[PDB]
Design a protein around this motif. Structure first.
Motif, PDB file in Angstrom:
ATOM      1  N   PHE A   1     -26.073  29.245 -23.209  1.00  0.00           N
ATOM      2  CA  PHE A   1     -24.756  29.026 -22.632  1.00  0.00           C
ATOM      3  C   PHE A   1     -23.681  29.637 -23.522  1.00  0.00           C
ATOM      4  CE2 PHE A   1     -26.996  24.980 -21.213  1.00  0.00           C
ATOM      5  CZ  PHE A   1     -27.413  25.550 -20.029  1.00  0.00           C
ATOM      6  N   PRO A   2     -22.682  30.286 -22.932  1.00  0.00           N
ATOM      7  CA  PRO A   2     -21.639  30.927 -23.738  1.00  0.00           C
ATOM      8  C   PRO A   2     -20.601  29.937 -24.245  1.00  0.00           C
ATOM      9  CG  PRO A   2     -21.208  31.282 -21.421  1.00  0.00           C
ATOM     10  CD  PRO A   2     -22.525  30.559 -21.494  1.00  0.00           C
ATOM     11  N   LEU A   3     -20.010  30.279 -25.386  1.00  0.00           N
ATOM     12  CA  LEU A   3     -18.874  29.554 -25.951  1.00  0.00           C
ATOM     13  C   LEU A   3     -17.670  30.486 -25.851  1.00  0.00           C
ATOM     14  CD1 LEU A   3     -20.526  27.804 -29.032  1.00  0.00           C
ATOM     15  CD2 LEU A   3     -20.567  27.204 -26.603  1.00  0.00           C
ATOM     16  N   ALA A   4     -16.858  30.281 -24.824  1.00  0.00           N
ATOM     17  CA  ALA A   4     -15.857  31.271 -24.454  1.00  0.00           C
ATOM     18  C   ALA A   4     -14.707  31.277 -25.454  1.00  0.00           C
ATOM     19  CB  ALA A   4     -15.332  30.988 -23.048  1.00  0.00           C
TER      20      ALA A   4
ATOM     21  N   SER B   1     -10.891  31.443 -26.589  1.00  0.00           N
ATOM     22  CA  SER B   1      -9.713  30.916 -25.914  1.00  0.00           C
ATOM     23  C   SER B   1      -8.604  30.751 -26.941  1.00  0.00           C
ATOM     24  CB  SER B   1     -10.026  29.585 -25.226  1.00  0.00           C
ATOM     25  OG  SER B   1     -10.544  28.647 -26.155  1.00  0.00           O
TER      26      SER B   1
ATOM     27  N   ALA C   1     -12.889  33.274 -32.400  1.00  0.00           N
ATOM     28  CA  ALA C   1     -14.283  32.875 -32.471  1.00  0.00           C
ATOM     29  C   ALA C   1     -14.876  32.770 -31.073  1.00  0.00           C
ATOM     30  CB  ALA C   1     -14.427  31.543 -33.206  1.00  0.00           C
ATOM     31  N   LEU C   2     -16.113  33.236 -30.939  1.00  0.00           N
ATOM     32  CA  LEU C   2     -16.884  33.092 -29.714  1.00  0.00           C
ATOM     33  C   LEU C   2     -18.338  32.932 -30.125  1.00  0.00           C
ATOM     34  CD1 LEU C   2     -18.660  35.879 -28.727  1.00  0.00           C
ATOM     35  CD2 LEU C   2     -16.320  36.760 -28.554  1.00  0.00           C
TER      36      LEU C   2
ATOM     37  N   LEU D   1     -24.846  29.217 -27.192  1.00  0.00           N
ATOM     38  CA  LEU D   1     -25.528  27.937 -27.363  1.00  0.00           C
ATOM     39  C   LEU D   1     -26.968  28.083 -26.890  1.00  0.00           C
ATOM     40  CD1 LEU D   1     -23.900  25.492 -28.522  1.00  0.00           C
ATOM     41  CD2 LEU D   1     -24.189  24.394 -26.291  1.00  0.00           C
TER      42      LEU D   1
ATOM     43  N   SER E   1     -26.392  26.833 -32.563  1.00  0.00           N
ATOM     44  CA  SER E   1     -25.245  27.594 -32.098  1.00  0.00           C
ATOM     45  C   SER E   1     -25.067  28.830 -32.966  1.00  0.00           C
ATOM     46  CB  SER E   1     -23.972  26.744 -32.127  1.00  0.00           C
ATOM     47  OG  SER E   1     -24.255  25.397 -31.784  1.00  0.00           O
TER      48      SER E   1
ATOM     49  N   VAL F   1     -22.200  31.759 -33.648  1.00  0.00           N
ATOM     50  CA  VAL F   1     -20.801  32.106 -33.433  1.00  0.00           C
ATOM     51  C   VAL F   1     -20.471  33.377 -34.207  1.00  0.00           C
ATOM     52  CG1 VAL F   1     -20.332  29.637 -33.267  1.00  0.00           C
ATOM     53  CG2 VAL F   1     -19.715  30.885 -35.351  1.00  0.00           C
TER      54      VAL F   1
ATOM     55  N   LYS G   1     -12.063  32.608 -21.678  1.00  0.00           N
ATOM     56  CA  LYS G   1     -11.669  31.585 -20.721  1.00  0.00           C
ATOM     57  C   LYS G   1     -10.291  31.059 -21.089  1.00  0.00           C
ATOM     58  CE  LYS G   1     -12.810  26.927 -19.064  1.00  0.00           C
ATOM     59  NZ  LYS G   1     -13.081  27.178 -17.621  1.00  0.00           N
TER      60      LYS G   1
END
Ligand code: NAG
Lengths: 195, 234, 219, 214, 219
Positions: free
Chosen positions: B140-143, B145, B155-156, B159, B197, B199, B232
């Motif tokens: 799963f992405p950590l968008a 923002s 940071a992006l 997961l 995770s 990043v 996002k």
């Protein structure tokens, strides 16, 4: 017929420490001693009581090949009538020696980064050796009057000690592979002959 | 280059068997006393077993916890070291190293080392002994923002969720992006699965232009995932 | 005739090293062994280490295991000990010891000892003493002397009437003042009746600087 | 490493008496590697006993070593005058870890003698250098312990005294010590009464000698 | 077996301070035939294979800095980094090769460092995860020291408990800081019944506990 297996002796991978030197009997073959002189570059090839150019014309009952490793400045002790730690305590030739000793520099094989401590010699002993004697004892050398009881300490020293064979050493302190050829002529038939 | 490349590990059921192997290059293998050393996760080094060179007898030695089940061997014609593990226990769960350590103090090689070194280790192969089953991960992405932004950097991440067993490998943009990547140590959830995770910080100027794709590979489940991570609005 | 002879006294600055020698004459050195010992002024014996002349194998006390070396030269029958990173607490007297050996065997005790090597470790510099008088000031028996103050290094010698006055002469050990220089006093007791008739001059010698001083002491 | 402890610290014995010196090891050690040494001031150690119980070449019969395990003893039967010195034991088993004892001093015993105390004023020649040296002398006394307190006017002084004691004499077997007060020249000329206070066993009451200057 | 045991288990000093590690063997590892101690020291960082540092007790491997120095003899050995650097944070094992091979328990060496407050970031769940019935909210703390960091999840100001787990990184080799990620996992159903999701961070380098939050109506 069968050729004398000098490759096994000269071209061995592991060489004996001088105190526990290594004898190999040679029998039932034909040796080309002329080729042995020109087989390589040996830094030493002193013959005693025989000319290697004319050794191809003689026959012997048996031939003993002794091999080990010593310092460079100790190759001069592998000769009749010598003195020093190696001659007196490790490998002693008789005064009536009748054979050739051979040596070459083995820094490429028997030295190690940080020190090669696998090659040993005898430091202490109660008396000099007889010719061709070999003492592989390991008991703690008693230098005083107190018994050592298999325990090192004061006046109780381990009999052996190791060369610190390092590659950057000077050629005098570098390892050399010695090979000594003894020729025996007895009342028996002769099984080792030249061509 | 002198190199030790272990292979052949993963998930195996208790009481089972498994053959590790290690392919060596760049030195004269046949002259080295090779050993295996293992490391249970979060724990220390533990010597498993050595085999001497053929010139010195080829004699093997094993440690007591594994003596009676493990078998070490050579194929000097292919420069490979093997480790046969049988009747496996859960206390055998560890990463296993093939190594030249302990050898140069005894073996026959001289001073002509190809790189001035003699002590070598492989990267390591992990062996998990468990009656549990394999499970592929969910990625799963950590968008990025306004909530993951400070001072021009953003940071992006990715997961990697609910997988067994270890390990997963994560690279970004097929290995093109390497600078600024943090991969956090996996945690063992109570359900018996792992989760971690990955990043990476990037200049926020590029977020409208650059494509960020994390490539997650999980070898024991034969799962490969490539995930676009897009911004996002938050 | 059978002995160990060590180096001369050393003065040293902190951080440097020092290498004392121990040359053996009179016995079979190659079968013997040398141990090293130190002892500060009026204190106990401190063991340093020891070497086996035949092998050169060494063993140092845990206290010095980092900053000490012991070596031997067989061709000169000499053992050396080198102490690194000298501090003030290294100011001591250093001893080598060995058992007598023969062509047969060795003794089972360190019976041969060297003369002892004084090693002063300080940041000071050589200086000549400034001697001062102690005023003699009863019905009989009087006390006078002189005070040798501020000198470096050790030692200093004190005579009275060029060796004539010996009875009642007490020359004390030196002390080490805060300024890093030594200072010692000397006293004699003389009959009070002959205070004016007799003349008392105390002689001082400090050979590390060629400073020599005689000083009269009057009431 | 191993620790050796000698008992006692000081022996006060007359010539002809019997000295018993103990050396106790922190662990059990072999008798083959325990030695005794003798030491006079200025001389190197001298081997009396080796192997716990053997005498080294040329040692008189009156020296005798005994012991095993952790308790070792050196006995001098009848004390000669040439026997009063400091004695050390040394363990030297194994190739490593050797140690000495703290040492026992053996000194001649004599009847109590009280010190004759002399105080000394600093010299005028010394005041030119900027420092002043006041000196107190204690002469030919026994036993060795004493206390010398420095009183300027009636202010007890601490932290500016240095002491020095001699070896006991070979004639009267007494000790002697000197204490030198040190003051700056300015601080010296401010006070008038400089007193040296001495207590000793041979003294009924403490003795004070003083002078008036400054 | 010959058994290696190290003390201490962990170690923490400031930059440039002295770090020492001890190693004890069951038997002596001094080989009489050559007077050599048959042991080595290795360094290992997370995710890496170990690297040889010292062998024959004191022989440095090539490339090892001079800060590293092995010492000891027989059955008691010491590894000493003379001035600890930020890139020496690792676990240091001692190994014997006297009889087969045996490693010690290792010693973790860590850098004491000046205080640094973390940068707090926060990510909302993905639509892909919500498609499957779950909502994972990640909180991120960046480059803080010391390691002790309290991360509490509040959901519409309701303290959460039992639904979050953490992970800390290795201590950085350059600026010696830590990073940390705390993952809160809810159901897709429970996630949509609430609005504000908050990561509250208590740390030493922060005056007041800092909060990073986001509204679901604004994501
Ligand atoms: C040893 O090998 C070399 C080359 O491999 C050869 O030239 C030499 O003759 C061999 N030695 C003997 C004694 O045959």
């Amino acid at each position: 017929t069968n050729l004398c297996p000098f490759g096994e002796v000269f071209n061995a991978t592991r060489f004996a420490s001088v105190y526990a030197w290594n004898r190999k009997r040679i029998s039932n073959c034909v040796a080309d001693y002329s080729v042995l002189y020109n087989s390589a570059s040996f830094s030493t090839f002193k013959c005693y009581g025989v000319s290697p150019t004319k050794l191809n014309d003689l026959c012997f009952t048996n031939v003993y090949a002794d091999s080990f490793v010593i310092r460079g400045d100790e190759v001069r002790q592998i000769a009749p009538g010598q003195t020093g730690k190696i001659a007196d305590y490790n490998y002693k030739l008789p005064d009536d020696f009748t054979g050739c000793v051979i040596a070459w520099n083995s820094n490429n094989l028997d030295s190690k980064v940080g020190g090669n401590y696998n090659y040993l010699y005898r430091l202490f002993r109660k008396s000099n050796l007889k010719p061709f004697e070999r003492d592989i004892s390991t008991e703690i050398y008693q230098a005083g009057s107190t018994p050592c009881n298999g325990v090192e300490g004061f006046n109780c020293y381990f009999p052996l000690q190791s060369y610190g064979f390092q590659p950057t050493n000077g050629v005098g302190y570098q390892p050399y592979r010695v090979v000594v050829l003894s020729f025996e002529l007895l009342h028996a038939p002769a099984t080792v002959c030249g061509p | 280059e002198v190199q030790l490349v272990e292979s052949g590990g993963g998930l195996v059921k208790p009481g089972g068997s498994l053959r590790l192997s290690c392919a060596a290059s760049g030195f004269t293998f046949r002259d080295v006393w090779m050993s295996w050393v293992r490391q249970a996760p979060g724990k220390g080094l533990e010597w498993v077993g050595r085999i001497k060179s053929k010139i010195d007898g080829g004699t093997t030695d094993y440690a007591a916890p594994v003596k009676g089940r493990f078998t070490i061997s050579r194929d000097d014609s292919k420069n490979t070291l093997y480790l046969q593990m049988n009747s496996l226990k859960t206390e055998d769960t560890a990463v296993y190293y093939c190594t030249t350590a302990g050898s140069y103090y005894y073996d026959t090689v001289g001073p002509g080392l190809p790189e001035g070194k003699f002590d070598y280790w492989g990267q390591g192969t992990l062996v998990t002994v468990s009656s549990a089953s394999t499970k592929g991960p969910s990625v799963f992405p950590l968008a990025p923002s306004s909530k993951s932004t400070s001072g021009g950097t953003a940071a992006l991440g990715c997961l990697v969720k609910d997988y067994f067993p270890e390990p997963v490998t994560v690279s970004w943009n097929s290995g093109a992006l390497t600078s600024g990547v943090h991969t956090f140590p996996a945690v063992l959830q109570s359900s018996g699965l792992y989760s971690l995770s990955s990043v990476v910080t990037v200049p926020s100027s590029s977020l409208g232009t650059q494509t960020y794709i994390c490539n997650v590979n999980h070898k024991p489940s034969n799962t490969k995932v490539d995930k676009k991570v897009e911004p996002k609005s938050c | 005739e059978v002995q160990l002879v060590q180096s001369g006294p050393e003065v040293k600055k902190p951080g440097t090293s020092v290498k004392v020698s121990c040359k053996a004459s009179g016995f079979t050195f190659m079968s013997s062994a040398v141990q090293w010992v130190r002892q500060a002024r009026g204190q106990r014996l401190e063991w340093i280490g020891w070497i086996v002349i035949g092998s050169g194998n060494t063993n140092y006390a845990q206290k010095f295991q980092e900053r000490v070396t012991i070596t031997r030269d067989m061709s000169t029958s000499t053992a050396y000990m080198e102490l690194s990173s000298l501090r003030s607490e290294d100011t001591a007297v250093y001893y080598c010891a060995a058992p007598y050996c023969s062509s047969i065997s060795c003794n089972d005790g360190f019976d041969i000892w060297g003369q002892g090597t004084m090693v002063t470790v300080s940041s000071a510099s050589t200086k000549g003493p400034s001697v001062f008088p102690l005023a003699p000031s009863s019905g009989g028996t009087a006390a006078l002397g002189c005070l040798v103050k501020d000198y470096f290094p050790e030692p200093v010698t004190v005579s009275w009437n060029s060796g004539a006055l010996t009875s009642g002469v007490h020359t004390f050990p030196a002390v080490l003042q805060s300024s890093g220089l030594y200072s010692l006093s000397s006293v004699v007791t003389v009959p009070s009746s002959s205070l004016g008739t007799q003349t008392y001059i105390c002689n001082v010698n400090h050979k590390p600087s060629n400073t020599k001083v005689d000083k009269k002491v009057e009431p | 490493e191993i620790v050796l402890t000698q008992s006692p610290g000081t022996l006060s014995l007359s010539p002809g008496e019997r000295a018993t010196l103990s050396c106790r090891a922190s662990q059990s050690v072999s008798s083959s590697y325990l030695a005794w040494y003798q030491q006079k001031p200025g001389q190197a150690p001298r081997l009396l006993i080796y192997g716990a119980s053997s005498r080294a070449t040329g040692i008189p019969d009156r020296f005798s070593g005994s012991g095993s395990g952790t308790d070792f003893t050196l006995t001098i039967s009848r004390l000669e005058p040439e026997d009063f010195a400091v004695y050390y034991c040394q363990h030297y088993g194994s190739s490593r870890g050797w140690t000495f004892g703290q040492g026992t001093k053996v000194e001649i015993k004599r009847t109590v003698a009280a010190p004759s105390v002399f105080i000394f004023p600093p010299s005028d020649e010394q005041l030119k250098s900027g420092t002043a040296s006041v000196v107190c002398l204690l002469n030919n006394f026994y036993p060795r312990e004493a206390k010398v307190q420095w009183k300027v006017d009636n202010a007890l002084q601490s932290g500016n005294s240095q002491e020095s004691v001699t070896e006991q004499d070979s004639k009267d077997s007494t000790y002697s010590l000197s204490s030198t007060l040190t003051l700056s020249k300015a601080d010296y000329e401010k006070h008038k009464v400089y007193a040296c206070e001495v207590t000793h066993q041979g003294l009924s009451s403490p003795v004070t000698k003083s002078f008036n200057r400054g």
